């Protein structure tokens, strides 16, 4: 064995409950947390009489749950804006800081956490969980042997018809700076890049719909229940178009509220000189889909995942992303999710808002 | 009316916890428990939720027990044929696990065994009590199929290798896959038939994919050490009956096929024919009967019953009851030794050649 | 310009006229035939159709192989006459191309093996169904090895109840045997091709008697009614097939069965490293064709698209590949001692109406 990992929390909600609690207890071999801070402290204790260990610190605002120097790393669930700040220099006044999904709503402030890191000493990750489901590394893994030959176009696939999040920080415009295209197309382009391996970029043109967000009859048919139509600070859909530097070029489909009819998301659609692929996952797939497309042998085939069944008596993402998060800072490696990476992918999205200038951005 | 049967368990592992103690707590008004497994706390968090029984870790103090009147052995096969029969046979009713033993004459020695004792006897093959094995066994019986002469038995897995116990280890199971799955198809074909008269059995065995490096990537049940598969992946037999009556059999762990079915039988009759389909590669149990209809070739399938708004439950029930009323169980123990005979010939094709009987 | 090769007919028959002449007007260029058939109206007929001007028509066929205009014979006839009109003559100056088994007896057919390499001439068996796309992208998919060995295979040949109730088929005298040597020649053909496997060390079969005599059996018959009291055949067998390298192969063979799936012209092979199948057969309106691998940990299936919009056969590609073998002087696919193997194995399975395996 090798002692433990000691782990500080900071915000308790959404995906602290969801995704971080769990996925830490099913790895407690490795870690137990005390932290359980938030601005909000009623939740904070009771996340800590949960998961908390033997008597453990409970405070109410961060500066001082990084004061405590038995925690070694620190979870940061925030909301967006507070992403850069409890993380960026603040979180590396001597730790090891796992930030969550979108690094950050601004360039700018991603910029200034990753040289916070870079001087850090330690380490270093996002929350795109979505790397490690069995599939996305299925195909990541094929890109990297090559099977698919050099990927010109790429799609980012990040729809729902109607599954506008009413139930949290989501609409908040001021909490987490913009709509759809940062809350689940910062998902898709994600694994597109990743497995493109391409991140160099060229040109950047996109397109911010508000439109079903103030409709009267838009809440109709959400599947969260209905949402104040006139109090929509945010988008409702946005599209976007990345060229890269090597002449790939990436199309983008994001949104929570939109008259299309299929709902895909955490997918991307790749194009190759010897093969293609695409991802399914969404509203509209119970299961999640994988695809290959090729000519083998003078005929063009499709291989996919087979249907897995039970036994007579006998027979996950999020924790696999914690637990190899974990073993990253215990024996001293790498992470999977690269800070530069996540950098790469908010700077687009970000490009493609500013793109709010009906302007190309060069990059 | 009848005061509920005493029952010791032997082996508190895998099949014992998902198979018996549910089936058990659901008979509860036939029965109570009074726990052994060599890895005694298996055996005391057994009994602390299905359970002031004795606890132990030797078999033998168990049989010393006197208030125990049922023996359930859920221990590997090698161990099937000791605990069983020289042993349990002392006044205590046994019901045995899936595979009777890896062994034709330990088998022989447990049936003799066993009609010594004048004690109760079965074998766990509740394959038999899926109401659509049921149905397949009863329209033969009343010879809805004709004279069978074409039987297969389907007990395939395209990589489903158990790996949280011995399975892979022929020193405590004797074999592999060819009796660990193969006997629940086997048991299935020859009981809807009921046919037993072996002439000659040909058979291969397949040492293929479990020492392979990338074997164990796609299993069901984890990776499994390469190094340490001591026994087949894959097997299958051709086995001939004095009545002209042909019966293929196909079983595995892991093999690169795409039908994952098992515990299935395939019957053609001279009147009808019928197949049952079952495993990985089937959401639901089916079962299809095929025949000419006013000569219009017609297929009669399970009709999908819904809401409004199992088999080892029924297996163990009729167990019980039989020792308790007196009457015979359903699986009977000849049927059972049937079949590993018929396996152990299979195997004896290490020898490239027909046995015979 | 290549001199059209000079083509001679024996046996005008079903399979003359449904592939042979139509593949030749397909491959008109390379070929023109100079018809023998002892019902002597459909020579003369066929002649009419698809001869070239003075043609020889006579109902002999050891008067055509006496004609020194032809060099290339096809013989069409039944499988009793497959081996004398092929062996001494025939391989007595002309290549010759003969139907699909080669003979029902193991002997017969070693022996026109023999007269065609004291021959010079080439040789090819009407296999045709080695030329479909599906087929070859499985046996080019194994000569690269991406299966790794093959070391059990199953070969199907199974009918419902689809009793060939025209033709030659149902006549034992003319044929030997009912569906094991009816279809399931083509299906252990494909079996042994893409394993590359011709090296037998065991045979056990079984044959059986029962829908072919009995009298409802012909009911719900795809081609309609057959007399079960002169039915001569049997209408089912199976049989287990070990190699020397340790493989197995199953086989499964009938016209009339009572199982759901009408699967013939089809196998299915498991390697150390992936699987294949095929699906051909009156349970299938398009072929199918799925290899089965794990890969990066997990299972998959890889099938054919589907094609479609038209725009804006293996008969005929068979006879080019075989023409031109012969102009080029080339070999062509279908190699005779392959053949032998097939014919030598499924006489092996009927030879259990001793009850004994037959060992190699
Ligand atoms: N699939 C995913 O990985 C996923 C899903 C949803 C959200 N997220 C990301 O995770 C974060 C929000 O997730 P959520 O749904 O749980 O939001 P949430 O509102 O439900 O949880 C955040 C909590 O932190 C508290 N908070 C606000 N400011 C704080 C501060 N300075 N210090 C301490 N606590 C503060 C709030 O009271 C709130 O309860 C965001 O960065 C969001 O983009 C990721
Ligand atoms: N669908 C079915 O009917 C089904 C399923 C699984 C297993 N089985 C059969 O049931 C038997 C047990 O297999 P399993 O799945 O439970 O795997 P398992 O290894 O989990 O069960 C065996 C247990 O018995 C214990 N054991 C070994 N030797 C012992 C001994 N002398 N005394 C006491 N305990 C001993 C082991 O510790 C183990 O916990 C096997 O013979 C197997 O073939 C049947
Ligand atoms: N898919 C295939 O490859 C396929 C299909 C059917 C038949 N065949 C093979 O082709 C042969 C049977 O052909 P068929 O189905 O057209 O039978 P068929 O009865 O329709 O035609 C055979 C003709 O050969 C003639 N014949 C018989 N003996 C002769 C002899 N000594 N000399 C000259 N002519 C003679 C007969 O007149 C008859 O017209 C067999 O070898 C059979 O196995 C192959």
Same mark, same amino acid.
């Given at each position: ?42 939740? /904070? #204790? @009771? ?7 033997? $008597?453990? *610190?409970? !405070?109410?605002? +961060? ?46 402030? /991603? #910029? @200034? ?7 850090? $000493?330690? *380490?270093? !990750?996002?929350? +795109? ?235």
């Amino acid at each position: 064995g090798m002692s433990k990992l000691k782990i500080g929390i900071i915000g308790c909600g959404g995906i602290a409950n969801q995704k971080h609690f769990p996925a830490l207890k099913n790895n407690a071999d490795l870690n137990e947390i005390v932290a359980f801070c938030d601005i909000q402290i009623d939740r /904070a #204790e @009771k996340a800590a009489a949960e998961f908390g260990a033997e $008597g453990a *610190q409970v !405070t109410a605002d +961060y500066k001082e749950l990084l004061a405590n120097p038995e925690v070694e790393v620190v979870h940061v669930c925030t909301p967006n804006v507070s992403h850069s700040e409890i993380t960026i220099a603040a979180f590396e006044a001597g730790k090891h800081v796992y930030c969550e999904k979108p690094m950050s709503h601004s360039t700018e402030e /991603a #910029e @200034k956490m990753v040289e916070a890191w870079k001087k850090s $000493g330690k *380490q270093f !990750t996002i929350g +795109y969980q979505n790397r490690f489901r069995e599939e996305v590394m299925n195909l990541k893994k094929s890109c990297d042997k090559g099977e698919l030959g050099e990927i010109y176009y790429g799609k980012a696939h990040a729809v729902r018809r109607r599954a506008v999040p009413t139930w949290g920080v989501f609409m908040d415009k001021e909490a987490q700076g913009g709509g759809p295209l940062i809350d689940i197309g910062t998902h898709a382009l994600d694994i597109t890049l990743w497995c493109m391996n391409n991140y160099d970029v060229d040109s950047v043109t996109g397109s911010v719909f508000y439109k079903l967000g103030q409709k009267e009859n838009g809440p109709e048919g959400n599947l969260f229940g209905p949402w104040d139509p006139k109090t929509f600070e945010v988008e409702d859909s946005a599209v976007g178009f990345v060229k890269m530097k090597n002449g790939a070029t990436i199309g983008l489909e994001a949104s929570w509220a939109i008259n299309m009819l299929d709902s895909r998301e955490a997918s991307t659609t790749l194009c190759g000189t010897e093969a293609g692929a695409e991802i399914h996952s969404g509203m509209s797939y119970p299961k999640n889909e994988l695809i290959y497309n090729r000519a083998r042998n003078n005929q063009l085939m499709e291989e996919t995942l087979s249907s897995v069944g039970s036994i007579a008596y006998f027979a996950e993402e999020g924790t696999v992303d914690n637990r190899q998060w974990l073993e990253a800072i215990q024996n001293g490696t790498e992470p999977l999710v690269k800070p530069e990476e996540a950098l790469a992918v908010t700077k687009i999205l970000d490009a493609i808002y500013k793109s709010a200038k009906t302007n190309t951005i060069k990059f």
